[PDB]
């Protein structure tokens with residue numbers, strides 16, 4: 447059975463916390479992917495249940511196992527907790543911290559300020575989400591883990607309302623690479639050396655975080671609007687970068703453009719990104735900036 451190494455320790459399937467199946471109740475579907483369903487569950491501990499299809503390959507099984515190992519080994523407030531697993535019964539379960547706010551992309555789109563609720567969100571809310579995820583990314587960086595797929599679709603929120611905390615909630619790409627196709631690669635989140643050379647470092651995630659920042663401050667738009675993957679690949683390789691999201695303060699856009707420096711050595715590490723995000727939250731002219739209310 448497969449092993450996983452993180453920090454200075456090596457772990458095994460036998461290390462995962464197995465929860466007896468009889469203690470687990472499924473409540474409702476949470477919007478299931480195209481491979482594996484996700485449910486709200488109870489163990490009365492509230493959890494999210496990620497399932498493995500009983501109709502799957504040998505590699506599917508091992509991928510599912512690896513994901514559990516990866517998430518169970520992290521210990522940070524901005525990475526979702528793994529409650530445990532139920533692997534000895536079928537279909538197999540991974541039990542995660544329940545994040546009632548859902549994924550970040552849907553949240554941003556669903557919670558955009560509107561004529562009905564014109565103050566659903568403010569600039570400081572967006573800066574706090576970005577700070578939360580940057581804090582998770584800094585943890586990964588200082589522990590030498592490369593996520594490879596930092597994007598709003600892979601972040602979750604503890605709740606819809608003001609006290610929300612954002613966390614990285616999916617590690618499927620890092621799992622795939624740890625051991626597929628061109629049209630499935632998230633090229634719109636990738637730096638040139640990543641999609642040209644297949645070189646990944648912590649500065650890979652820095653670039654992707656810049657794109658996440660744009661997703662956040664655009665309130666859930668798809669990156670490079672109207673551009674296809676190949677067009678973006680050629681655009682970015684030639685020095686092209688996204689314009690500021692609508693109403694985006696200059697100090698915030700400046701963080702994005704630094705994350706997108708062509709040379710990875712010219713891009714900030716996450717300690718520096720965090721310092722700059724914090725300076726934005728202190729600037730009244732940033733946080734007093736009104737977000738666009740779409741009619």
Ligand SMILES: C[C@H]1Oc2cc(cnc2N)-c2c(nn(C)c2C#N)CN(C)C(=O)c2ccc(F)cc21
Nearest residue numbers: 476477484494542543544545546548549600615616
């Ligand atoms: C594995 C899954 O985890 C959770 C999903 C949810 C809550 N808590 C956890 N742990 C969730 C979602 N939507 N809604 C309405 C809820 C609720 N309540 C998002 N979703 C369907 C996903 O598949 C998904 C997407 C991204 C990601 F990073 C992890 C996940």
